Write a protein that binds this ligand. Structure first.
Ligand SMILES: CC(C)(C)[C@@H]1NC(=O)O[C@@H]2CCC[C@H]2OC/C=C/C(F)(F)c2nc3ccccc3nc2O[C@@H]2C[C@@H](C(=O)N[C@]3(C(=O)NS(=O)(=O)C4(C)CC4)C[C@H]3C(F)F)N(C2)C1=O
Ligand SMILES: [Zn+2]
Length: 158
């Protein structure tokens, strides 16, 4: 009934999060580990110090947030306005993405949806290594991902 940290992706470190049935990612920004509601629901983040309740819960935007667990360093928000981004997956892959709006980004090369499955909550990074967005959904046709939908980093504030 809680979310557990089961690993990380070393870039800054993205957290690999798991429930009893699902696994996804968590990205710390502004002292808050953000993730997606469709993975974590309203569940707490567990750990040796005891369960911690979510401090942010938005079902409409599919965005949730816990206070960053001790040791989870926050990534730097992107302020350079880059349009060439990089999606970090749970498998440490770094998929180039061309931003085509506030919440959308086109893939330079279509990827099978299976390779992006489980990477919701991962960051989209700019050429400087700063987080410009948070992976939420994929634009899928014939089982192939041609674009992604993400929560803009501007929405990841206190
Ligand atoms: C066809 C498709 C690809 C399955 C689907 N595309 C899709 O919907 O595209 C349209 C067009 C562009 C945006 C989107 O508009 C609808 C908005 C969807 C949403 F995201 F805002 C969302 N809000 C919710 C809020 C509350 C409760 C449930 C919600 N459920 C949602 O959507 C659901 C979930 C989301 C998802 O699967 N995300 C990913 C992922 O990895 N998850 S996961 O870790 O394996 C796992 C399931 C363990 C947690 C990255 C994408 C993929 F790479 F795996 N979905 C379905 C999709 O992406
Ligand atoms: Zn930047």
């Amino acid at each position: 009934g809680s979310v557990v940290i089961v690993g990380r992706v070393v870039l800054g470190e993205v957290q690999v999060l798991s429930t009893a049935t699902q696994s996804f990612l968590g990205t710390a920004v502004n002292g808050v580990m953000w993730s997606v509601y469709h993975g974590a629901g309203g569940k707490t983040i567990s750990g040796p110090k005891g369960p911690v309740n979510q401090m942010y819960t938005n079902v409409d935007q599919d965005l949730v947030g816990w206070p960053a667990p001790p040791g989870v360093k926050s990534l730097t928000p992107c302020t350079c306005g880059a349009s060439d981004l990089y999606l970090v997956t749970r498998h440490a892959d770094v998929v180039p993405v061309r931003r085509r709006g506030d919440t959308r980004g086109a893939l330079l090369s279509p990827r099978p949806i299976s390779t992006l499955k489980g990477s919701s909550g991962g960051p989209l990074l700019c050429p400087m290594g700063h987080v410009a967005g948070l992976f939420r959904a994929a634009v899928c046709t014939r089982g192939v991902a041609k674009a992604v939908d993400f929560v803009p980093v501007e929405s990841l504030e206190t």
